[PDB]
Symmetry: D2
Subunit: 492 residues, 4 copies
């Protein structure tokens, strides 16, 4: 998911829309924009679809105001495609809206406590609605009006003591302003930027990725620190405060592999440079372990891998060729009467340049392997195009465990690497050779750009969950949610 | 524009839709699909928009049948977003539908003769509707039913003697089959493929590019020859015939520079390889001519130039770096009362990775320069990202003339290269240096993939039009068409706005 | 179906739209409007739905021009909701569009001759598309331009000798003007009106009913005579001509019973007065034949019967009371998994005021009885509301035959009156008593408004078809059309449902 | 506006939809349906438009559950066409949704108190959102779970002590059930019905009008009494309780004139029979005051007046004729480029049967006269059709004051009768004669059907507001709201 918040001095509707279009890769299922108008009321438009389809001129006209937040959703367990999108909203105390990228590992318990102690009903199964309700509940402990920055930060600090998981959040409180805060492990991405309008006016914005600041002409200030909260008043005054105990930087390593845009700088690391480094490490590993193999050409599987593969080919002294072309436009498959509904294909998303595989031993490079379904079909396509031996290299280590911090991953059972070694995975996908990046190599590739990061969030790779509250019982619970989400989406 | 025609033995609606999605880069303004159903009637769905938006379940349900054609439109003078899309249709004789990629340079005169001699009314400003009417009138000359293959080919031959310009067409005639044909100069692209089902039951397909054949699992047979026609009967039989007097192969060189997909093979030339060769030629030219310059990195301006720049970087022994990222998603800019601080036009398209430009003399590579406006903005973006020297290289030679063969290019006075030396263009765009591909090099780069092609359609580069009927009266007439189109688009907005 | 044609001196889009809204009762399945713009090209918008839903701002914006025609469709065999709506169009000769209300009893044969002799393909099952093609082919016989009025009338005359059935048509020919014409028997309705703007600048209009002229402020001139054609040039000149050999006035009697609006005057007969007279006749028949019965109140079954029942109540000296209220708004009944306790079909249409039936012998009045199914349900509703005796009177005589002249009626075996005595129908519907209007009385009731009309089109009542070409082979062919239409509508639902 | 609530034993989505289609005359601007699903969560669909356009198959599929409420909106001051439609919803305490037909005369003060004492933000300017927040605030005073019927009734009783105005309301509380309640003056209409499914199962429903019970096959039980509340549990148990002090029946007299359907029975009075009685009274008044006039025919102005006019013609011994035909389908007028946007017409809504006016002195009958604009044009049409003298009779007395209890009326200035006598009104509309029903006659016409009603709510006619809190200051306040609503709708 992707978030954006703009505390401006002029209408923000078009700017939030624009920022969301460059964060569109973070989620294409739904989009939502909410602003605070001249009457101190929220105006909201959220619906399923790409940003360009969700917001029509008439919705834009309704989104009045100089402060607003936006969200693009990537479906996850509990927040299916059929469910209510973000931002969520509550009417007490004061009027609060919140957008979130992440996941709370103790959502179910929080929901119980919200109901039993506060009589606050949660209408969806989205942990973001729960997060908003905890925050609201903490903001409701004040008698004086309006709230001071100290009270807002105290409410966030109290919220941080109650919830667990990963979260980059942005919210607005009517009559007060905008708040942005990050989990105490710095797992989900969140940067802060500013735009000087004149001598006395400065606008502020926060976004999941720095590309949103770039596209709008905002100057990058810094990443929001792990545990930190930022509060910008209605009036344009900026406050910041550390709202967690023992904060530490454990950025999600997966953002760097393929999730984030290459032109973003997350926790001082260029995603692009980290990806080139991944190719360097993988090339070095292949040159060492596959020294005797006959490889005629290195072909990336579009699109994140093109540069990684370029670096591999360079390290290996082999030619790099565009053997696969990603179909920029993909359409749907229709369930028609009488007609047999045939095959689910990768041919719909990819085309093989026939001449580039013919009578060659090819080394294909992909960013990662999850279910292994696409790689299987891709290898088959390489063979149909006339390839002799087909080898596959993965820029990421084996993906064996589920992500419960905001990245949608299928359950452990559906991860081909779960409970399987490299050779068995290779035989299943039908490759002549398979090699994965070593985790310590991926770490060094990213860390080379910012040696200050000591440890990253690596759970999908090593099964070590930093919040220490993930056991099989929880993972099974998450699966039941997926099952319910499936029934709902099936229904639509 | 892109076209596709499939004569199958099973339902074609989903396959035509899928073919158009991979041909979508040829035109995103509109799409249309028409099929012949079991009752020998046309079923049609066309509208503005991307293929994925134009066809919904209820439209696919009505598109029944085993034979059909499809089209995606790129708007050109006489065919604006405002006007009716393809494919077009006529009810006499027989019921004929056609789709076309190209342009008829004598459309005006054809429209007049059709009115005067045949009383055939043309409802739009589309030369494709005219092409269809000339074809339909030639088919109306027979007095026995059904028409024989030879009759249909004779009609196409008669049509080619009458019309002039460039065209790749696919059409269907109720009760007979599907026909496809290409202009006498092989300017516009068109390939044929097949898919065997069993003993003597094969499906055939034609499309603007071979990627459409690939995506559907059809075996590529070959390019439809210049001036040739293909006729596939409803019963699945194949016939072909040269229907032009002096066919020559003069493929549009623009398809290779950036219009077609790299994974396509057009007239036996891999588009990808040709582009890599364009990089080899341009890099050698740069090594020879810019020998004294210190360039720290080669940065492509997405998306067509990535492989060209990579090859240029290889020839120069310089690092290649992704300095610009193209925003995959672009939205609408709504006209709002007093749009305070508008987002820069260039930023809507691209984003610069600041680190890749900081304190570096950069060599940017773009596929071509037309108006020169976006080039100037990209150069600016680079200096803004911290570049010291900013050089620009164009994979295509100077674009100085309008294209009247189906590729949308502005008028000559609008082309920055028009009437200007490279150094003048350089000053205007603000580059520290500017260099273009030499035309003979571009030709060699593409010809290297198929030496049999001796001449390419190069008019945008040299002003030489193979149809020899392009004059100022014609260009001026095209400008008029463009003006009426602009008016039609302006009106459509006027109350889309007043409706609020 | 209803049609409208306006040849004005100022934009007609809004006026045609407004005219269709007051003609909306003639068909709510689809609507279409086509205009001739300043460049002599057709601009068209047609789709399923009510006029208010079919035409949005963006469609009206494209419907430019000072002359145009409109149509609203009531679905009939060969023209289902699934099929293409009117108006239809052809591009040769000249560019001709037509809209029609009626039905051609020899459509099949016409389609065959058009194919064989002219190679004219008919894409839909609509006899209106056929009518247009016959007209277009007759117009293709001249070799001088423009066509003279006499040429156009000669073409309409040729068409009338070829086609058979009932029809009110309005059409436009690019570069010439608008024509309107009526069948030789004056079966279907059509009136002409004018609106003076200044010295020798008058706008003309034709429509199915005079309410369309009223609503637009046009002065009513007269009914288009049986077999007559009207031609209004683009320059605003009026021409007319009898284009039929032996025209007779045999107005559809159904228009008067309930199809047309009461405020309309058709062939000089006020629909309202005719209906009041229908009440006078039926009330006198009831007073004579049901003299021994105790009826406490007369209750109309909304909406056409209110004034008829009022008059019947007047003749019987009995109170008239609103016992049923028609639900002005009816929604969709969604097919949901296990629809527990479905709302009664009859309740979707009407609601009974319990107080008006309680312990009363009620006389209900409906305009006609077709299948008899809703009649049985209404009777039930009344007993349920507490009525003791429930009697039913039909303003129309027994409906025993299908209509093949443009009014949608089921087949003969589907009409409850078919092959049954009044007492048998009575038992089936469950009424304590049933009485129908006598046909001669219905005729007198309408004729009283204009004694010049000596014969009406009565086929649904007497089985006598004026075109003398209705046989079982024809009826069976119509049933086939209806079946194919049903299949097309079923398919359209199949994945509207599977899309969820 | 119209409301409906169904506490069933099987899915209610289609039934609520159906009930709203027969209450559609109560408001065509927007419609909303909210149900409580099997998961104890609300599912909602509300939007601008007729009921048949607002709810598509996909929304119906989402509206799962055996309990639900619906609303159709008629735009009023503060709840413009551009504003959020009903039902409104709050997430604490427990989850409550409410739909309302009426208006609170002290909404502005309640909103202030909600903000200052409870920190509850009101996002629209709709008094229904405010009503829901007061109720929620009162329901939030309980510690034990779940709430007993006594607690729910206590919260409604407390709500009744705080708010003032007119209101027929229906609401649902998650985990509890459905509640329906009526203002202490019995101003806005609300009936209760039931449907026996079997020996142990009985469904209940409440609606603005009895026709909604009829169309669904529910048996009419009774009107909900002034001040009374009804609570039906999830489990199907019905409770009722008087929740106001000194309740009294003052039904809105205006519902009977033209607002309600003729087939409804409101406070034991048949709307149809009351309308015939109005014609009887008006006929008697005309036969007495216009004894010497030459009148050739009585012509009703469709559609509510057809029966009233029929009775008048009967009393006068004159023929009744259909001189005007209402166009059942009306379309919009388009703002096109270049074309002059001509006249706003009644000809779009009405057609004159020419033959029925020619050389006749006609007596036209309308249900009421508000702005006087339509009557002016109608009289003109009668003249164009050839009428000699044109007389107009109004089934309702002069409308001189604004309605602040739920019926949309323009401000005092726009009411032709405001500050004007009959003859001046007559001269303005251009009639040859004008006669209005006497208020005491209208009262007797309605009261004849239920002599138990002592006084009705007659403010639009006499300026006496039963809640005693309406002064010019308030009416001016209401106008400023209309002005803001206008700017919003203009904007769209
Ligand atoms: O942004 S807009 O105001 O235009 C749409 C508001 N949005 C519509 C969908 N519902 C959930 C439906 S349900 O889950 O209750 O069925 C959340 C609110
Ligand atoms: O002119 S034609 O009838 O051929 C074309 C008819 N039109 C397509 C519908
Ligand atoms: O904030 S604004 O006033 O601009 C928009 C108000 N918004 C419109 C959409 N509905 C839900 C639609 S649905 O969930 O019923 O489909 C919630 C209220």
């Amino acid at each position: 998911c992707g978030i954006v918040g703009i505390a401006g001095v002029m209408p923000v509707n078009q700017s939030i829309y624009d920022a969301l279009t460059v964060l569109q890769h973070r989620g294409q299922d739904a989009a939502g924009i909410i602003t605070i108008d001249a009457n101190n009321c929220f105006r909201l438009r959220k619906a399923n679809g790409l940003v360009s389809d969700v917001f029509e001129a008439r919705h834009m006209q309704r989104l009045q105001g100089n402060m607003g937040i936006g969200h693009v959703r990537y479906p996850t367990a509990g927040s299916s495609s059929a469910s209510e999108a973000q931002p969520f909203y509550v009417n007490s105390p004061y009027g609060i809206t919140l957008a979130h990228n992440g996941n709370l590992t103790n959502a179910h318990e929080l929901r119980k406590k919200l109901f039993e102690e506060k009589r606050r009903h949660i209408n969806t199964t989205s942990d973001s609605e729960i997060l908003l309700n905890i925050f609201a509940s903490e903001l409701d402990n004040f008698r004086h009006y309006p709230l001071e920055a100290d009270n807002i930060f105290a409410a966030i600090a109290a919220t941080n003591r109650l919830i667990r998981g990963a979260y980059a959040c942005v919210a607005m409180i009517i009559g007060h302003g905008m708040v942005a805060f990050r989990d105490p492990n710095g797992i989900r991405p969140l940067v802060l930027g500013k735009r000087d309008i004149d001598e006395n006016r400065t606008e502020y914005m926060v976004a999941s990725e720095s590309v949103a600041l770039d596209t709008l002409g905002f100057d990058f200030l810094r990443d929001v620190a792990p545990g930190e909260a930022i509060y910008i008043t209605e009036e344009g005054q900026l406050f910041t405060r550390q709202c967690a105990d023992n904060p530490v930087s454990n950025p999600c390593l997966f953002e760097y592999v393929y999730f984030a845009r290459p032109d973003s700088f997350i926790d001082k690391i260029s995603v692009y440079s980290a990806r080139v480094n991944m190719g360097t490490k993988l090339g070095e590993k292949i040159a060492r372990e596959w020294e005797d193999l006959d490889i005629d050409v290195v072909i990336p599987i579009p699109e994140t891998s093109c540069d990684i593969a370029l670096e591999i080919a360079r390290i290996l002294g082999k030619p790099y060729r565009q053997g696969f072309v990603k179909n920029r436009y993909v359409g749907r498959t229709f369930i028609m009467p009488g007609q047999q509904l045939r095959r689910k294909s990768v041919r719909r998303k990819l085309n093989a340049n026939r001449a580039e595989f013919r009578d060659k031993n090819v080394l294909l490079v992909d960013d990662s392997i999850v279910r292994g379904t696409t790689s299987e079909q891709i290898i088959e396509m390489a063979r149909e195009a006339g390839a002799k031996k087909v080898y596959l290299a993965s820029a990421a280590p084996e993906i064996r465990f589920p992500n419960v911090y905001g990245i949608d991953m299928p359950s452990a059972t559906e991860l081909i690497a779960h409970g399987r070694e490299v050779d068995e995975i290779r035989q299943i996908i039908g490759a002549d050779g398979l090699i994965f990046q070593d985790l310590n190599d991926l770490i060094d590739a990213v860390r080379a750009e910012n040696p200050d990061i000591q440890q990253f969030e690596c759970s999908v790779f090593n099964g070590v969950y930093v919040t220490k509250d993930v056991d099989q019982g929880y993972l099974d619970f998450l699966d039941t949610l997926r099952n319910d989400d499936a029934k709902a989406v099936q229904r639509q």
